[PDB]
């Protein structure tokens, strides 16, 4: 018996994510894992009251979907001309420095503190060792500031530029608040 | 300095009236005679002034 | 944290000159790659 | 049409700045600092651009501090009296929102307090009484510039772009001249660093000034003579200001280069000692000089301004700083000792006395930094060399 | 189901009105020959002293307290300017000291004389209690506004017990009253700034040497605000306590109560019609004469805060209000300072 | 209650009267107005009646009564209370 809750992204505002009971059978067992979206064909069922009769007030049946099948789910981008154009730009060596200089325009910044930004923002390699541990493919930048130094504004740049970039502030909070709950 | 405590604020007066009026009660009084009050002064001065010894 | 960026510090004419000109320049108004192509560049390379 | 003639008559004259300053708060007697401090809030910077990006500030802030009886409140009452779109609260009793919206539940929104005064001057007495809860909210107003509101219902974001004039009493209601202002005002660091600048006032006894106060106050409580009058009437100064608001002062001028050295002139002398009023002086102060400049531009109707007005804003910040005051690296450390000892002793004494003593206690201080005997010997021979040269 | 004569300026309209439809009573009326007696008594030189002994007949010595309060009864002169202004006549007095000093008795007496005053204990008080209850009426089952304790006390004198002991939320009412002289109520049903113009006489119980300014407790800013702050202290009298004991240890005998301070010349009902008369028919102005000495006093103290000046010019004008002088003498500002210095001769320890 | 309220109309006794710190001394400093304590905190607005008598045994400032020091110096107690 697996409890299927409705996907959080698709919830209409001001409504709680109601959910239903799901009954797997035979091979459908173990196909599911918690945390995942799942597509089920199962038929709907009731029986049998079931058990309330104390706090309802009425002859109300339970709602249980006896399951049938299980399946996994189910504005800017690069472009051919733009990339074939693009490739020729990355060939010069000094492109690095140019990029760093481009990385935080309005601060006037530093060459160092921006260099870190560029480095971590730009990437790394994950990189999974078969089959065990992936090390880490990212660069964690501690930017240790100073009152009056740009230390805030810099990272704000990163929220504009990066693809997926999230601003959690400290706490208190500017949503989101850093702790899954 | 030294000596003191001053200033012998009115609470010492009222205090000695009240001590007086206490000593009276062991005479059972209602009279509150002079030797009573004098005695209260005695107890008061004897309290302190033992710092001269 | 692998990279620690410390910021300072005692005043330098070049450091404070160079900065102040830039800030002042900003507030008064009212070589590097275009921002759009860099913010595409990054995504491109990461993918 | 008939009035615009008057407006022209105002912009023509070379003194109308000074007229403004002197005419601001009749009730109040002198101080000349907080006059400018009050007016320069009414006339704000460009508060616009620079994109891509995040927008510059823009507007301005002030927090008046001083021993009570200094009539710091009279300013306040005068501002809530004079300028439209001005809210006055005495918080401690804010209580909470107050300065933010309820929201009313629907999804109709309460005004209220702070936000109902928008693009304007909100005046709060006593930051020191409102404790933690709301101060944070104010910080959220003066940092993110937006007021985000979500309560048990419809989520929301409501803009408030405002200037905040506060009056904050010291820890003991006194100076504490010797203490750092940082330690005196007793509000948290982040909200502190957003207020530029404080314009601290302390009142001390001077018989001329004393006589002038008693005279002036008794004057005030006399129906005659109430004939004391400002060069500008309280009614006209509004239409004047509103006119002066329609300008978009912009300095393209390359005399802005000068400003840099001015910024630069400001921090150097204020680097050593650190026991001076610092602060830092923070870049945010460079950023502050801008909005100050544009403010004075608003004042004088002049566009692209002057390096001179820049110098005025500059000196202004300077006194605002001083009121808070109260290989040759080796030679530098000794020269630092000379300036440090004299600067302290001149303020808390004449300074003089046995020159040997200076070396004596100097060695006593630097002995902690001495990594090796060579450092001691060098420091000793250097201080000795400086004194021998000095003589 | 649930839980002396008034001033003219305050009455105002009810004089300007109540004439038209007419009416009777209201303002206390005085015959001619008794007036002829007042204007005679004013001549008496020891008057300023005399009245001071007449205020509290039971209460012995401590004359400057009786006296400062005597001026609290005459306090100030009201000023409207063109508009606004309104500093009133209000003068406010805290007094602290050793217990059993009669500090409460005075409160009782002032309470008895002052026409509209109201008497509140410490801790029996709350910021809601001192204004605007907005209670249910329960007769009509409706919501009706009630006047708080300070609003009632508007005019005349509010009396306060154990002021040191008020809760921290309370006293936050007073920073409004003492300065503005009005109270501003934005709460609940109705939003308005309503006027309470009232003197305050507060009693305090402190917790040689030590800082005194520390030893009254209180926030010192609020403490500096009070017009005249009395600190009870030994006057070195000896030579007093005997006299005072003669006063109090009586009654005692005779069991029946006759006189009290006798033999002492005292007015009785005369001083109330006197005080009233003084208040309605006199409006003293300092003129050129006060300001010099007035200021030099303030400096002499500075050598404190500006309020102390406000104080002096108001307190003094009460003195001059008495003696029937439309103008202040350069003289009479002397003791008007000395009263503030009186507590200083008591701050020596 | 306890102490003062617990014993009232009769004698209350105190030892180590110096070490009692501060908040206590305020209670006792007030109870000589007799007939009173006033508790304004939290769930209590009451003013209860303590008719108590007080006897207080205390030690002079360390170690014992230094005669080279004036009285009131070797007695650590304020003059507000001793009166």
Curated annotation (Swiss-Prot), chain A:
Outcome of swapping residue 6 to K: In allele MCM2-1
Subcellular location: Nucleus
Annotated ATP binding sites: 145-152
Source domain of life: Eukaryota
Effect of residue 151 to A: Reduces MCM2-7 complex helicase activity. Abolishes MCM2-7 complex helicase activity. Reduces MCM2-7 complex helicase activity
Oligomer and partners: Component of the MCM2-7 complex. The complex forms a toroidal hexameric ring with the proposed subunit order MCM2-MCM6-MCM4-MCM7-MCM3-MCM5; loaded onto DNA, forms a head-head double hexamer.
Additional remarks: Present with 1690 molecules/cell in log phase SD medium. Early fractionation of eukaryotic MCM proteins yielded a variety of dimeric, trimeric and tetrameric complexes with unclear biological significance. Specifically a MCM467 subcomplex is shown to have in vitro helicase activity which is inhibited by the MCM2 subunit. The MCM2-7 hexamer is the proposed physiological active complex.
Role of this protein: Acts as a component of the MCM2-7 complex (MCM complex) which is the putative replicative helicase essential for 'once per cell cycle' DNA replication initiation and elongation in eukaryotic cells. The active ATPase sites in the MCM2-7 ring are formed through the interaction surfaces of two neighboring subunits such that a critical structure of a conserved arginine finger motif is provided in trans relative to the ATP-binding site of the Walker A box of the adjacent subunit.
Protein family per UniProt: Belongs to the MCM family.
Swiss-Prot record, chain D:
Annotated localization: Nucleus
Motif Arginine finger per record, residues: 193-196
Residue positions where Phosphothreonine is found in the record: 252
Ligand binding (ATP): 66-73
Domain MCM: 16-218
Function: Acts as a component of the MCM2-7 complex (MCM complex) which is the putative replicative helicase essential for 'once per cell cycle' DNA replication initiation and elongation in eukaryotic cells. The active ATPase sites in the MCM2-7 ring are formed through the interaction surfaces of two neighboring subunits such that a critical structure of a conserved arginine finger motif is provided in trans relative to the ATP-binding site of the Walker A box of the adjacent subunit. The six ATPase active sites, however, are likely to contribute differentially to the complex helicase activity.
Quaternary structure (record): Component of the MCM2-7 complex. The complex forms a toroidal hexameric ring with the proposed subunit order MCM2-MCM6-MCM4-MCM7-MCM3-MCM5; loaded onto DNA, forms a head-head double hexamer. Interacts with MCM10.
Family: Belongs to the MCM family.
Other remarks in the entry: Present with 13400 molecules/cell in log phase SD medium.
Name of this chain's protein: DNA replication licensing factor MCM6
Lineage of the species this protein comes from: Eukaryota, Fungi, Dikarya, Ascomycota, Saccharomycotina
Gene: MCM6
Curated annotation (Swiss-Prot), chain E:
Record's GO cellular component terms: CMG complex; cytoplasm; DNA replication preinitiation complex; MCM complex; MCM core complex; nuclear pre-replicative complex; nuclear replication fork; nucleoplasm
GO molecular-function terms, A-Z: ATP binding; ATP hydrolysis activity; DNA helicase activity; DNA replication origin binding; helicase activity; single-stranded DNA binding
Cell compartment(s), UniProt: Nucleus
Signal peptide region: none
Record: residues binding ATP: 97-104
Coiled-coil segments: none
Superkingdom per UniProt: Eukaryota
Keyword vocabulary terms for this entry: ATP-binding, Cell cycle, DNA replication, DNA-binding, Helicase, Hydrolase, Nucleotide-binding, Nucleus, Phosphoprotein
Family classification: Belongs to the MCM family.
Function description: Acts as a component of the MCM2-7 complex (MCM complex) which is the putative replicative helicase essential for 'once per cell cycle' DNA replication initiation and elongation in eukaryotic cells. The active ATPase sites in the MCM2-7 ring are formed through the interaction surfaces of two neighboring subunits such that a critical structure of a conserved arginine finger motif is provided in trans relative to the ATP-binding site of the Walker A box of the adjacent subunit. The six ATPase active sites, however, are likely to contribute differentially to the complex helicase activity.
Protein name as catalogued: DNA replication licensing factor MCM4
Organism in which the protein naturally occurs: Saccharomyces cerevisiae (strain ATCC 204508 / S288c) (Baker's yeast)
Range within the parent protein: 468 to 838 of 933
Swiss-Prot record, chain F:
Residues reported in the UniProt entry to bind ATP 1: 59
Subcellular location: Cytoplasm; Nucleus
Family: Belongs to the MCM family.
Biological role stated in the UniProt entry: Acts as a component of the MCM2-7 complex (MCM complex) which is the putative replicative helicase essential for 'once per cell cycle' DNA replication initiation and elongation in eukaryotic cells. Core component of CDC45-MCM-GINS (CMG) helicase, the molecular machine that unwinds template DNA during replication, and around which the replisome is built.
Subunit details: Component of the MCM2-7 complex. The complex forms a toroidal hexameric ring with the proposed subunit order MCM2-MCM6-MCM4-MCM7-MCM3-MCM5; loaded onto DNA, forms a head-head double hexamer. Interacts with CSM1 and MCM10.
Note: Present with 166 molecules/cell in log phase SD medium. Early fractionation of eukaryotic MCM proteins yielded a variety of dimeric, trimeric and tetrameric complexes with unclear biological significance. Specifically a MCM467 subcomplex is shown to have in vitro helicase activity which is inhibited by the MCM2 subunit. The MCM2-7 hexamer is the proposed physiological active complex.
Entry protein name: DNA replication licensing factor MCM7
